[PDB]
Amino acid sequence: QGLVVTQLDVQPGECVKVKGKILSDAKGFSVNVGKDSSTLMLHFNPRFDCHGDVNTVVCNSKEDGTWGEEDRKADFPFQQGDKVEICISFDAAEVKVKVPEVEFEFPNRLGMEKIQYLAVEGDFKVKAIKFS
Amino acid sequence: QGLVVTQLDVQPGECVKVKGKILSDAKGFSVNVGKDSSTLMLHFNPRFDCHGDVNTVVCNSKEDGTWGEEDRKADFPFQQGDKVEICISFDAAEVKVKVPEVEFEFPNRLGMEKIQYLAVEGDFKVKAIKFS
Numbered sequence: 001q002g003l004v005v006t007q008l009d010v011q012p013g014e015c016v017k018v019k020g021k022i023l024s025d026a027k028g029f030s031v032n033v034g035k036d037s038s039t040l041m042l043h044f045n046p047r048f049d050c051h052g053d054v055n056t057v058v059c060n061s062k063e064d065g066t067w068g069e070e071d072r073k074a075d076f077p078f079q080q081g082d083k084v085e086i087c088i089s090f091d092a093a094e095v096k097v098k099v100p101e102v103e104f105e106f107p108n109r110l111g112m113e114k115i116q117y118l119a120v121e122g123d124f125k126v127k128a129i130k131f132s
Numbered sequence: 133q134g135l136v137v138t139q140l141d142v143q144p145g146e147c148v149k150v151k152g153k154i155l156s157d158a159k160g161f162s163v164n165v166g167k168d169s170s171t172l173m174l175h176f177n178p179r180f181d182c183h184g185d186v187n188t189v190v191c192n193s194k195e196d197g198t199w200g201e202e203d204r205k206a207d208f209p210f211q212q213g214d215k216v217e218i219c220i221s222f223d224a225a226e227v228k229v230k231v232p233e234v235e236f237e238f239p240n241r242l243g244m245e246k247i248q249y250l251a252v253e254g255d256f257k258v259k260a261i262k263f264s
Contacts, residue, residue, distance in 0.1 A: 001263075007136045007251075119139075128262040 001126040003119070006036075010115035012091040015132040018118075021125045024081035028053075029122030031086060033095075033115045038065040041112045042095045044086070044104070045122075046078050059106045068109060077101035083127075090115070134253035137261065138168075142247035144223040147264040150250075153257045156213035160185075161254030163218055165227075165247050170197040173244040174227045176218070176236070178210050193241045200241055209233035215259075222247070 001020065010016055010033075018031060028047035034040035040062040047053040055076045061068040077099055078084065087098040090108055097104040120126050142148055150163055160182035166172035172194040179185040187208045193200040209231050210216070219230040222240060229236040252258050 002139060003137055004139045005135055005137050007134060009133065126263060128260055130260040131258060 001124060002121045003126060004037075005118040005129065006116065008116045008118060010131070012089075012113070014089065016088045016115070016118065017128075017130040017132065018086045018088070018120060018126065019084075019128040019130070020120070021083045021127065022078060022080055023123040023125065026080045026123035029120070029124035031088070031097075031124075032062075032117070032119045032121070033088060034062070034110075034112065034117050036117050037119065039063050039110065040117075041090065041108060041110055041115065042088075042097070042106055043067075044088075044097055046076065048078075048080060057104065059104065061106075061109045063110060071106060073104055075102045075104075133257050134251060135258060137250040138248065140246075140248050140250065142263070144221075144245065146221065147262075148220045148247070148250065149217055149260075149262040149264060150220070150252060150258065151215075151217040151260040151262070152252070153215045153259065154210060154212055155255040155257065158212045158255035161252070161256035163220070163229075164249070164251045164253070165220055166194070166242075166244065166249050168249050169251070171195055171242070172249075173222065173240060173242055173247065174220070174229075174238055175199075176220075176229055178208070180210075180212060189236065191236065191238045193238075195242060203238060205236055207234045207236075 028050040030045040032040045043060045045058045057073040059071040095106045160179040162177040165174050175192045177190045189205040191203040227238045
């Protein structure tokens with residue numbers, strides 16, 4: 001699956017939940033949130049075996065179509081063929097991504113105050129998108 | 133609060149469920165499904181008091197920015213402040229909209245074989261979008 005959601009108005013405090021299933025041969029997938037495809041507050045990209053990266057979560061921002069400095073995480077609570085729910089929230093200081101085992105944090109570099117764009121790409125099958 | 137979902141590949145037989153709450157002071161809302169904003173396979177529009185309509189579901193299609201002939205349905209199972217889930221599925225011949233109280237049918241006028249666009253508009257707050 002790989003859909004795009006626009007016309008959003010997610011503000012700090014609100015929670016965005018993405019439920020789906022990781023393909024049984026996933027190279028990796030990504031979950032981007034921001035203003036648009038060129039300006040992302042967060043590029044959550046768990047990589048099983050993609051671009052030389054093996055079982056590593058890469059976080060990054062994007063502004064004016066330019067990638068920021070990568071932030072590689074130590075924890076990788078994901079496995080192929082796994083059905084997971086990803087919860088995203090943020091504030092003026094950072095973005096939080098919670099999965100049942102680990103909570104990932106990434107600084108709100110762009111100082112964005114609302115999310116209007118969400119896109120899921122890669123080897124992930126979306127089953128539901130919830131707002132809270 | 134009306135969002136837009138693009139980049140979809142909903143094939144006939146697949147179920148799209150929109151769950152949310154109708155505002156207590158709602159006058160109307162709509163669920164559009166199709167190719168893009170100007171080419172819709174279905175414009176499901178429950179009107180409480182909208183365009184001179186009082187408690188009536190108006191269904192229609194749109195091709196190249198032009199509405200087809202309005203289809204007013206006999207049943208109106210909605211009430212303001214009501215929390216609902218609207219299920220949509222289709223095939224080459226017709227589109228089905230299931231509401232816990234009533235099921236609506238509309239012919240697939242355009243012969244559309246996949247849904248790439250979904251937009252919810254009006255006095256409706258979306259809580260979740262599921263793909264079954």
